[PDB]
Amino acid sequence: FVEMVDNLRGKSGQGYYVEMTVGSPPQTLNILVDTGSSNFAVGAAPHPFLHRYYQRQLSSTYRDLRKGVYVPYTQGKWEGELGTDLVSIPHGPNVTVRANIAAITESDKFFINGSNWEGILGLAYAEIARPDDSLEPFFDSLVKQTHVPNLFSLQLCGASVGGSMIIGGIDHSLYTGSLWYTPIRREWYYEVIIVRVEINGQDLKMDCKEYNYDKSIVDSGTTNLRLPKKVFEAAVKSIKAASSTEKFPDGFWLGEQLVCWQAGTTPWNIFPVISLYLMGEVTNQSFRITILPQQYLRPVEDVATSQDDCYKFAISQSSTGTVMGAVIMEGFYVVFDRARKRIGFAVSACHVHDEFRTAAVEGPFVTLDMEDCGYNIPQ
Numbered sequence: 001f002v003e004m005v006d007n008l009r010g011k012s013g014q015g016y017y018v019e020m021t022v023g024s025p026p027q028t029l030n031i032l033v034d035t036g037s038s039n040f041a042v043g044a045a046p047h048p049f050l051h052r053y054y055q056r057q058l059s060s061t062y063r064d065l066r067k068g069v070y071v072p073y074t075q076g077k078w079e080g081e082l083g084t085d086l087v088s089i090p091h092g093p094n095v096t097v098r099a100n101i102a103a104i105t106e107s108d109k110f111f112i113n114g115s116n117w118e119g120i121l122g123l124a125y126a127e128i129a130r131p132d133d134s135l136e137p138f139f140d141s142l143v144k145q146t147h148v149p150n151l152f153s154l155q156l157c158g159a160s161v162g163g164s165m166i167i168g169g170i171d172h173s174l175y176t177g178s179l180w181y182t183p184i185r186r187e188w189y190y191e192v193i194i195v196r197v198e199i200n201g202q203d204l205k206m207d208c209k210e211y212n213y214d215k216s217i218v219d220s221g222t223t224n225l226r227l228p229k230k231v232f233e234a235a236v237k238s239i240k241a242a243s244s245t246e247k248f249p250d251g252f253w254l255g256e257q258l259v260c261w262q263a264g265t266t267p268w269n270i271f272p273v274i275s276l277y278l279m280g281e282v283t284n285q286s287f288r289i290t291i292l293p294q295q296y297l298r299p300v301e302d303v304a305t306s307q308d309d310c311y312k313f314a315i316s317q318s319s320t321g322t323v324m325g326a327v328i329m330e331g332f333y334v335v336f337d338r339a340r341k342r343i344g345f346a347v348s349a350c351h352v353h354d355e356f357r358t359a360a361v362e363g364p365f366v367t368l369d370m371e372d373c374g375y376n377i378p379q
């Protein structure tokens, strides 16, 4: 695994990517690591924001599947053609596999200027693959063709950013303390269950099904912690109360505006810690992961504003359920244990902390109320 350490790069707020090769002879591309989708999709035609792209005419091993694919997102969309080809991860496991590839021929608001990635590696399950669940995702092909163990782990390290994707195992050098596991509720997204939320120690006191309306997922391809409307409004109220010694524009709380302080003077202590309690592997047991403001107040690098440190509020409202994005994942080592249908969390070797508070993963906690917190009926 040591050879896989530090194999992720990126720019803050732009996405963590890993180097891959496609085709024969191999064409190198940087690929966004995305646990919230299930297609391997790469730019395959020129684009102003792309420095390079997949040139299929140069790959003898490309096979056309003679099928188009159209993928709209809330923001942005792309269109392309399906095929298969040989794929490798130079700083991953030492194998080459044949995998499905969506060649992106047209796109809108998909590629990001200066992000330095040219495609996306969807690491979730076939159920949410496009055009449908018959298109085998990359990691499924990897496991079937190489018998590398059916799990991977992600260590995303915040501020240029970096990290590690360990394919096929767990690297103990990347975390401290204990690994705590929460069950994968359903294999489509990496869906999990949140059973309690506290902000600076104070329970939001909602029916726990609200936390998972209509699902909660772990998503390396989303920046923010995204929360259902009801939970979001409660969270903002609590954070506002905690930080009330300073008043910020409403635009800040909507993520429409930055807040800035003179470089080095950010008042971290007036912002509360957020604790997310995740369902444990035993009935009505849970553990919590705790989030510092250094995680949910994201610095926006800009030379023009650099007399100051300026931040975006990286918690936002969702109508599609909770998303535990990078602001949650950064500073933790997150194990996607597909074989045992569970997600593990531990404190990352590259964790967030000032001299007063430290991000944590800890437990066990017990709850009397026997209610299932899943928004849908369990199976």
Ligand SMILES: C[C@@]1(c2cccc(NC(=O)c3ccc(Br)cn3)c2)COCC(N)=N1
Pocket: 013, 014, 015, 016, 032, 034, 035, 036, 037, 073, 110, 112, 120, 219, 220, 221, 222, 223, 326
């Ligand atoms: C396919 C989809 C998608 C499409 C295009 C770009 C992205 N991600 C990013 O640009 C990005 C930026 C910063 C950080 Br930290 C993580 N990711 C994600 C749709 O949105 C949800 C999802 N998980 N994947």
